[PDB]
From a paper:
However, analyses of the formation of TF complexes on DNA have revealed that many TFs also bind together across the family boundaries, in a DNA-dependent or DNA-facilitated manner. Because the DNA-bound TFs are fixed at particular positions relative to each other, the contact surfaces required for cooperative DNA-facilitated binding are very small, and can evolve rapidly. We also generated an unseen test set by solving six structures that represent several TF–TF–DNA complexes bound to optimal DNA sequences. The structures included two BARHL2 homodimers with two spacings, HOXB13 homodimer and TEAD4–HOXB13, MEIS1–HOXB13 and FOXK1–ELF1 heterodimers.
Author numbering:
A (entry chain H): 206 to 293
B (entry chain I): 304 to 396
C (entry chain E): 304 to 398
DNA sequence: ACGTAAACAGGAAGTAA
DNA sequence: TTACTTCCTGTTTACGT
C-alpha cells in the first residue's frame, strides 16, 4: 500500500529472508543489483496491489518506465541486472 | 590450435573440474573457453556441437533447476555407472 | 493432434492464403487457428514461437502499417528471392 | 527442417492514485 | 500530474532434442 517498485526492491534487498535468495547486489557500491528469482520478486510486487499472478513481463515494463524518470537504468549485457541512479 | 579431444571428453573434463561434479551448459562453455582459447564464444558452431553431444550421450544425465536458484538452463552430471572410466580417459589426447 | 508442419511453414501458408500476399501477426494467428484447432489462442506459447520465427527468418520481410486500418502491428510478406519454393513446400508434411 | 521458453524494448490505452 | 498495468508487436538470448 502506497509503495513504489524501486522502494519495494530496496526493501527486499535489505531484508535477510530475501537478501541473497530472490535479489542480490552485484556491485552494492554502484547500486547495481540482479533479480535472482525474477518470477518470485514479480509475484511479491503484485501481492501489494493484490494482483497475484504478476509476471516479470508486466513488472519489467514498470522497470523500463523507470529509465525515463532516471531512477533505475538497465545493465546492458548482464541478465537480470539494473542500477538505481537515485541512492544515499 | 584445435585441442585433440572429443567434445564429449571436454564435457567430462569440465564436469570433473566442477566442485559438486555438475555444470550448466553455460558453465561448461566457460570451462572450455578458459582452458582452450581456440574455442572463442564468438563462433557458436562448437557450442551447438557440445549441446548435441549432451543431448545424445546417455552417460550425460540432466538435473532440473529448482526454486533455490531458478536460472538459465539445467545442471549436467556424469552417470556414476561409467563415470570413473570417462574421467580417467578424459585427458587421453 | 499437433499439425506436422514447421511454424515457418505455417506462416508461409498463412501468407499465401492472404489476398495481397501479406498478413499482420494477428492475421497470421487467426489463419492458423481457423486452419488447425490444436492451436487455441487460449495458450500463448505457440504465438510466441511464431513471433520468434518471424523475427529470425530473413525470408520473412516486414511492411509498415497504413491508414486503411491503423491498429495492432505491421504487415508481413515473403521475400520474392525464395518465396516460390517456400510456397511449394509450405504443405509438405513431416516424416 | 527447429521447438520452446524466457529476457528486454517501447508505443499505446487502462487504472489508480 | 505521477506511477505503474494490461496488452501487443517485435527483437534477442539461451537451452535442449
Amino acid at each position: 500500500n502506497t509503495i513504489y517498485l524501486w522502494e519495494f526492491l530496496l526493501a527486499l534487498l535489505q531484508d535477510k529472508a530475501t537478501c541473497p535468495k530472490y535479489i542480490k547486489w552485484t556491485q552494492r557500491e554502484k547500486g547495481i543489483f540482479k533479480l535472482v528469482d525474477s518470477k518470485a520478486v514479480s509475484r511479491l510486487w503484485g501481492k501489494h496491489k493484490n494482483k497475484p499472478d504478476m509476471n516479470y513481463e508486466t513488472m519489467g515494463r514498470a522497470l523500463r518506465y523507470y529509465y525515463q524518470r532516471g531512477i533505475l537504468a538497465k545493465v546492458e549485457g548482464q541478465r537480470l541486472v539494473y542500477q538505481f541512479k537515485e541512492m544515499p | 590450435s584445435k585441442p585433440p579431444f572429443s567434445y564429449a571428453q571436454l564435457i567430462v573434463q569440465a564436469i570433473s573440474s566442477a566442485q559438486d561434479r555438475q555444470l550448466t551448459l553455460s558453465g561448461i562453455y566457460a570451462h572450455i573457453t578458459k582452458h582452450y582459447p581456440y574455442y572463442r564464444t564468438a563462433d557458436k558452431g562448437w557450442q551447438n556441437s557440445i549441446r548435441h553431444n549432451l543431448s545424445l550421450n546417455r552417460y550425460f544425465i540432466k538435473v532440473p533447476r529448482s526454486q533455490e536458484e531458478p536460472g538459465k538452463g539445467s545442471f549436467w552430471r556424469i552417470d556414476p555407472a561409467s563415470e570413473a572410466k570417462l574421467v580417467e580417459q578424459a585427458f587421453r589426447k
